[PDB]
């Protein structure tokens, strides 16, 4: 089927789907729109919002339904019902956390003190219960890697920009990290993607 | 199975799964705890958020990915992976919205300022997103009920009591709700269960 994914440039809510795709070795049509073009491209969106992503002429909305989508029937899925609840169940408490952040805050002052608080008194309590969860176990869910692996490493590389010493306490966590990076279809898209902040 | 549901007492996060079981006719242990127990049972959860549902001892987290735990292979899911996506992106889309408000925020000054802001701004552009991806169609998503629907009938009765004249303008979204609310098993459920506010 032909796939369009349109999102901004960068990596954001719209990376998790670009992974998907290089891990599946599926072609699409990365489609990254500039701010002069929102007005335009809005107006197309079910419910204002990127990414979206189009197959065969029709619309699919929510980077996490999508994603959801594109991975049925994979090995990226989950092995059983009850993991793949656990799959959703990760990236959903992993969203929750990125959703906290005042990503569109005009005033960069309070933006920034925003950022600043959540990534010292909340984070830590979170990448605790995360590197807790995940125990001497060499995934996230089952003995193969998900996209809830695939999540992590994403969101952990934003939060990273925010605060390198995020994972000083957790090298486990940032084994899993590593892990992801290495697979060689993911390593790939990593290293040609464009470069972005976010 | 062995179901067992743990949360506050109010509809909140967890009524999507309790409108599951009572469509689905399916007898579960509906535990609500109260505040001051709240503290002790946290300090035993992976997470620390609830709801949280026990099935035949395993322990699943994260409101929706239970709720989509419960619906797989039932006739509550979409009829094709793709309606399937749809439904994931419906619930998501209200549950981002329904997540913007400050329900645990202490300041009644800054609470009462989102909340409004919320109401009045927000919430009718997403009535008219949704009135429009609706149209004239008996259900959100394909021929027959989904927990889309149900999610909508859960998440505009808490707004309606905020805003009451919220769905003035769209009387098909109006509709929606008492189309859902008819369905004998939820009927029977909403007469039965606990009046709370929230
Ligand atoms: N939870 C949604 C997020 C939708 C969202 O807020 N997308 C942002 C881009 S990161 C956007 O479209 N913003 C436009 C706006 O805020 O009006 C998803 O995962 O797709
Ligand atoms: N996004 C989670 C909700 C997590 C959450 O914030 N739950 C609230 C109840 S509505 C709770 O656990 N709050 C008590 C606390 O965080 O200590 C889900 O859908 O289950
Ligand atoms: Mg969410």
Request: hydrophobic share 40%; glycine share 4%.
């Amino acid at each position: 089927p032909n796939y369009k994914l349109t999102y901004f440039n960068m990596r954001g809510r719209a990376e998790i789907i670009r992974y998907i795709f290089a891990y599946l070795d599926i072609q699409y049509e990365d489609h990254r729109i500039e701010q002069a073009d929102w007005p335009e491209i809005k107006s197309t969106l079910p419910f204002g919002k990127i990414p979206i992503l189009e197959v065969d002429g029709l619309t699919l909305h929510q980077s996490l339904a999508i994603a959801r989508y594109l991975t049925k029937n994979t090995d990226l899925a989950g092995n059983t019902e009850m993991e793949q609840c656990h799959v959703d169940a990760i990236v959903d408490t992993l969203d929750d956390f990125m959703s906290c952040f005042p990503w569109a805050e005009k005033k960069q002052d309070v933006k920034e003190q925003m950022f600043n608080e959540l990534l010292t008194y909340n984070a830590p309590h979170l990448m605790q219960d995360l590197d807790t969860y995940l125990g001497g176990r060499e995934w996230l869910i089952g003995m193969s890697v998900t996209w809830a692996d695939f999540y992590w490493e994403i969101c952990s590389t934003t939060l990273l920009v925010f605060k390198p010493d995020l994972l000083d306490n957790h090298p486990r966590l940032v084994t899993l990290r590593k892990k992801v990076q290495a697979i060689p279809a993911v390593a790939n898209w990593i290293k040609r993607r464009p470069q972005t902040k976010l």
